[PDB]
Amino acid sequence: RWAPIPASLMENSLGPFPQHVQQIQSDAAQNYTIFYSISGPGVDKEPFNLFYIEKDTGDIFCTRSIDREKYEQFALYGYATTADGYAPEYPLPLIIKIEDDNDNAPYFEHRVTIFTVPENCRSGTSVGKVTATDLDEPDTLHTRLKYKILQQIPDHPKHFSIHPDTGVITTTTPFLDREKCDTYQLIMEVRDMGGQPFGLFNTGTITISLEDENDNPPSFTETSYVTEVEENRIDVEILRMKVQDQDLPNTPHSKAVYKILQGNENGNFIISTDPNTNEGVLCVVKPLNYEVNRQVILQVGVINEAQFSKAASSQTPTMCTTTVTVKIIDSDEGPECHPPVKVIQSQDGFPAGQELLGYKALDPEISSGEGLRYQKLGDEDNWFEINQHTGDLRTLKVLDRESKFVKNNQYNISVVAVDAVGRSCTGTLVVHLDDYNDHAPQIDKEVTICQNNEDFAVLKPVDPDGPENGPPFQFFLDNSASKNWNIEEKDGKTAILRQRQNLDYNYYSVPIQIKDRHGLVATHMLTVRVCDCSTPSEC
Amino acid sequence: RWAPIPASLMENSLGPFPQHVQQIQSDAAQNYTIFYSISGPGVDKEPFNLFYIEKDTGDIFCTRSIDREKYEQFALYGYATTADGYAPEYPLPLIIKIEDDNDNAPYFEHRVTIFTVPENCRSGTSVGKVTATDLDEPDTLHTRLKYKILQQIPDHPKHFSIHPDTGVITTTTPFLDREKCDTYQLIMEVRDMGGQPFGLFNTGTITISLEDENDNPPSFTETSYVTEVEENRIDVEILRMKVQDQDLPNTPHSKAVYKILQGNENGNFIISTDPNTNEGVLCVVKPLNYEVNRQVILQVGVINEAQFSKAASSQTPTMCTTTVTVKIIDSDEGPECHPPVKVIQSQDGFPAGQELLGYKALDPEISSGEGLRYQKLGDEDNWFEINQHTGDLRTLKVLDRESKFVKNNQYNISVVAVDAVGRSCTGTLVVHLDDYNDHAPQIDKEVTICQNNEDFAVLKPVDPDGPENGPPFQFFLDNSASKNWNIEEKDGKTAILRQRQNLDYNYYSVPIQIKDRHGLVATHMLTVRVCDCSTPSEC
């Protein structure tokens, strides 16, 4: 079957109705009469009675106006029957095609649309795309939409340009900046018919608001800073420096972050950020001493939580920094005494009535150290006497390491220094005595031996001198015990009193001399007890 | 077969070519491949390659612009065959109908055309009809013509009016006159599109020339005429009168015809029309006699060869006529003599030397008959002698009816009258004389009779007088022969000489008297001889 050739009706005909469409006719109309009849969606179906046919002339007619956008075409059947109801001709499948006119204006899905763009973006940066629906016959001039910007606000300079065919808005300058203007509005138009002035149209708004980029570093209020704090302070804020950021406030592009760049090596200072005011609070956390440093110079800088961009302040070093000089003020302190211990050395044979360098107390204000009233405290055998105005020492006794108040060969005396108000230090003074051979080997003199269980005694000398000036000892007999006693010296620190087999139960006496390593003699009278004991207790 | 549904093309398509017309498609295409092809006057016939079909898509296209006025529609055949040569479809009869736009202006067949009408016609008289060719599609606005006169010249009054739809020119007044205006021009316009101002148009001329009708009778130059001709003249023109006709000259409406209305009863005059000058020649054909009438007065009229019309001077009495007075002149004539014979009566016994009224000779100039010199000619026995002046008779001899110069009782004598110049007539005078009884019956005297074969004779008298003064006669005897002779009168002119038986052979003498009807006696002596003869000569 061949496709039917379509007759065409223009939508929105006003009249006069009934309006004429086409004329169907059959050649078999000769010889005998024929009754023309019609049927299809449009006559005996929905929509009803849109068409009808003159029973004789075969002329088709139209009873009402048609909206192409509701009905695009009608597929009908043409008939040729006769009064008797005979049917010479098969039915004619015809179609009536509804043609389109520009009876619809293109409109915008939404009155006002938003787009957003990052500031400082490249020109030709495409920002977005608009689309308008036009219900006319598609892919025809009646539907060919053309876009263009009707007006921009602020009016100049124009930063936007829309491609008329696609509807893409794009940028025209690279100089978009949120800090100069944060939002632009464009009034738009859609004209069908290819944009020719007899086209149908509507307008709409399209607001463009810029998204912020951190293209501005923060900057301090004043060009440079100065302040004051007292020495030996802690947990106190020195100053508050405020800052300016030209970007979006209360955001990582706005919030500041300070850093002490140079000057804070020891850790004396710390800086932090008041979160409610975004200023930098400078505090003292470890104390300063006026005497060591009178002036500290800090260089503090500021940065944003989030990073910098735009490539004008990014390649180049643009953290803005100011130099804050913190002055420390003087407090007149009591006296200090470091190290907590001084030490001086001397010979053990050091004479009395001598002057010796004692504890030096350094006054912090003036290094001369005068104006102080020293004072001894912990002196046992009173070896010393202090100079009240210079803290020097005067020997009273002859010094002597072998004193029963000499542990480790040292003597302890503590001194209290006092200033002209009531403040006081304390120092400890160690007296390290070097040794001299001023003693000789000493021993006990009450010897004791049993009879049938010992033929000897063991006698043990002790040189109170130092290990260098002590043993090895040398033991001599006096010949008072000529050939009734004898002594032998195996080691250099022990000796054994060998009696001879000529003994009585009595108290004999044997004089014995003993020598130190150098040759200092002592003489010792031993009273030996000769008991018939067993153990060294039964006597 | 159902009639094909036509797809439509606008003539004068600008483009863009190739342009899409319609799309042929076959249902049997889902089964196996089909290659579409078309053919008809428009593809492989004339005009060639205007159309073509995409073999697969079935779209028909058009390659060039079409002039509907060259080709009103194209009847094509669409074919759907396959590579294998199968043919699902019989060929599809298509027709591509070319639509018309108003691209032709209606024009006039001839720049200037002529029509003609007779003058003095009724208003609404149809003069002619114009037709313009417009090659556009008939029965549409593109050809719906409206006609109109743009200008008529002479400008006023407008005598013509054209019907805007049909193109028939008509008259508007009845006052058309060729003698006032012979020709009109109409400047015309034809506007298609129903004469609406955006219609196409052209102009033309239409000359109207009036046909002449005889609406003017001819009229004489002079108000009246006078002239002179000679008495007793023949075959000569008396005068030439010219005439005026304001109609079409040298035509049956101009050429004249004269007729004598009154005055020419006897037939003296005849008039005719000179064909070379159209004037009237008045002639004499029977002669005039000055003495009878000195002046004749004629009534002449003139009319046109062709009859009069318009029914204002044709229905109404308008033959113009003039009175011609023709003067007759006197001619000095010879003498005339009518009747050519006179007759006069008299007694036969009329005396000599007597005067009698004779022949009258009429001189025409003066009726006195004087100035005339008469003269006798034919008088035999000289009965008369004529008077030379006037026409009298003088008896010379005594008159006598029984004269031997008188036949039938009349006497002829001719007289010639002569005037004082030399002209002469001739006349005869018959003299019928009355009878008198002056003679008596006379007879011979020589009788003849025989004896034995005759007893009587026969004698016959003759009275020279008239039958009235003659017989019947009466015969008397003198009684000289007492009883020897006797006569009897049977008839009125008979006589028989009866002798008696007492007779002897001798020569007797018998007196016989005889009288006429009235009683005049004569005596005659007969010498009668009676011999014994036999025949009428031998004695």
Ligand SMILES: *[C@@H]1O[C@H](CO)[C@@H](O[C@@H]2O[C@H](CO)[C@@H](O[C@@H]3O[C@H](CO)[C@@H](O)[C@H](O)[C@@H]3O)[C@H](O)[C@H]2NC(C)=O)[C@H](O)[C@H]1NC(C)=O
């Ligand atoms: C006389 O005064 C001096 C003052 O220093 C005493 O000598 C000091 O002895 C102390 C205790 O032995 C030493 O203290 C240190 O202690 C830590 C742990 O507590 C240990 O790790 C160290 O090795 C050291 O022993 C101190 O260094 C030492 N000072 C000096 C200058 O020698 C001395 O003991 C005093 N005399 C008497 C009789 O107490």
Ligand SMILES: *[C@@H]1O[C@H](CO)[C@@H](O)[C@H](O)[C@H]1NC(C)=O
């Ligand atoms: C219809 O009538 C015509 C008369 O000219 C005739 O030729 C034709 O055959 C008729 N129709 C049929 C189907 O025979």
Ligand SMILES: *[C@H]1O[C@H](CO)[C@@H](O)[C@H](O)[C@@H]1O
């Ligand atoms: C520019 O950018 C917008 C959003 O990225 C697009 O919609 C447009 O087509 C062009 O790429």
Ligand SMILES: *[C@H]1O[C@H](CO)[C@@H](O)[C@H](O)[C@@H]1O
């Ligand atoms: C675009 O402009 C028209 C002006 O004709 C407005 O009516 C419309 O609302 C939109 O602003």
Ligand SMILES: *[C@H]1O[C@H](CO)[C@@H](O)[C@H](O)[C@@H]1O
């Ligand atoms: C688009 O929307 C704006 C409001 O944002 C209107 O002012 C404008 O006329 C258009 O309707």
Ligand SMILES: *[C@H]1O[C@H](CO)[C@@H](O)[C@H](O)[C@@H]1O
């Ligand atoms: C300084 O320091 C000592 C302890 O080392 C105290 O005993 C003295 O009284 C002073 O306060």
Ligand SMILES: *[C@H]1O[C@H](CO)[C@@H](O)[C@H](O)[C@@H]1O
């Ligand atoms: C009037 O009559 C003329 C003939 O005199 C026609 O030619 C014209 O068409 C109209 O009928």
Ligand SMILES: *[C@H]1O[C@H](CO)[C@@H](O)[C@H](O)[C@@H]1O
């Ligand atoms: C009819 O009249 C017009 C005047 O507009 C002429 O131009 C034309 O030639 C025709 O004579």
Ligand SMILES: *[C@H]1O[C@H](CO)[C@@H](O)[C@H](O)[C@@H]1O
């Ligand atoms: C008819 O003819 C005359 C000239 O004879 C033109 O003047 C007129 O315009 C029309 O062509």
Ligand SMILES: *[C@H]1O[C@H](CO)[C@@H](O)[C@H](O)[C@@H]1O
């Ligand atoms: C009168 O006279 C003429 C001559 O003058 C004759 O010819 C005529 O016959 C008549 O006698």
Ligand SMILES: *[C@H]1O[C@H](CO)[C@@H](O)[C@H](O)[C@@H]1O
């Ligand atoms: C009488 O007779 C004569 C001749 O005698 C004629 O000549 C004349 O005319 C008249 O008749």
Ligand SMILES: [Ca+2]
């Ligand atoms: Ca619609």
Ligand SMILES: [Ca+2]
């Ligand atoms: Ca549209």
Ligand SMILES: [Ca+2]
């Ligand atoms: Ca539409």
Ligand SMILES: [Ca+2]
């Ligand atoms: Ca920026």
Ligand SMILES: [Ca+2]
């Ligand atoms: Ca920014």
